[PDB]
From TrEMBL:
Residues of the OCP N-terminal domain: 16-164
Top-level taxon in the UniProt lineage: Bacteria
Keywords, sorted A to Z: Antenna complex, Chromophore, Isomerase, Membrane, Phycobilisome, Thylakoid
Name of the protein described by the UniProt record: Ketosteroid isomerase-related protein
One of the protein's GO biological processes: light absorption
Family, per entry: Belongs to the orange carotenoid-binding protein family.
Single GO cellular component term: phycobilisome
GO molecular function: chloride ion binding; isomerase activity
PROSITE patterns referenced in this protein's UniProt entry, alphabetically: OCP_N (PS51773)
Gene3D superfamilies: 3.10.450.50, Orange carotenoid-binding protein, N-terminal domain (1.10.2090.10)
Amino acid sequence: YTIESARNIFSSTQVADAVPATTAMFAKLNVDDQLAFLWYAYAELGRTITPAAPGKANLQLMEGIFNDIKQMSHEQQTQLMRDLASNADTPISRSYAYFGVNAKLGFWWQLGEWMKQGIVAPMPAGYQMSTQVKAVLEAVQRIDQSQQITVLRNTVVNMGFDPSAEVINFKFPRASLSPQFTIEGVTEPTVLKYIEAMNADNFEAAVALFANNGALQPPFQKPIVGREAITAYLRDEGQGLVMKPTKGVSETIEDGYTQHKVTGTVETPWFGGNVGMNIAWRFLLDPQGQIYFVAIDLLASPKELLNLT
Ligand SMILES: CC1=C(/C=C/C(C)=C/C=C/C(C)=C/C=C/C=C(C)/C=C/C=C(C)/C=C/C2=C(C)C(=O)CCC2(C)C)C(C)(C)CCC1=O
């Protein structure tokens, strides 16, 4: 077995292809229209769901930058939004590039609030009734909420400077009591211990279960190899996630390796159970019961939760 061949481990599982397709569409817009799409897509989403406050302590990690953006002309604030959206090399764009996913999301969230108060100039958006942006809007609204918030996350993860260590990491309260999940059809300790570690916010215990040369493939992303790179990834994107697998199958294969497919929902700290992402986990364990490979898939539809062999 090789990482390349373990990527195919249950090949019938079907994924939300519309996510990268819709990001590719957003990429074809000019900056004026990328901003107009962000403003409207967020306002439209805010008809059903509003992201939860990320915390005073988390947002205090960027207090310096927030003070700058407040002691700044409406014209300066406008220019910053354009600079972040256009991938410009300015001081705050360079800083933004060292925010982790949640800090980037939190940066935008805290500006949203001050927009409501007039303390920050709104989105300086080109027109949102532009045909090009109206078409990318239609594509977003045609897909489920888990896909919409994923598209919205991607466009925000891709703003500011592109520099090819010092990443700001939001931390969040553990959600609930000891049994946060129960998996029908899977008692494999390594699988259970992974989900327990993630829900406990203990990413060292989660990565401890990986082989020295093991890998983690996030949704729509390349595999991440070895405990150091996996642990750094998870210290960013794993924070505040609650993982609610409910069913799966275990299979022994060649050389005393085992395969496991587990399905359920994942809840972001931002939306809680308002957006239950339908997720599969595909694990290849070597004979020592260690994780050689695990893929995480945003599933195509709720029907995929029941596709198990
Ligand atoms: C932009 C903007 C604004 C605001 C914009 C705002 C506030 C936008 C807010 C958007 C937010 C908060 C979206 C968040 C998305 C979260 C996702 C998709 C996470 C999924 C994680 C998963 C599946 C994790 C899975 C995983 C599992 C299960 C593992 O087991 C392994 C790890 C892994 C992590 C991979 C304004 C307010 C200013 C208006 C205009 C404007 O410009």
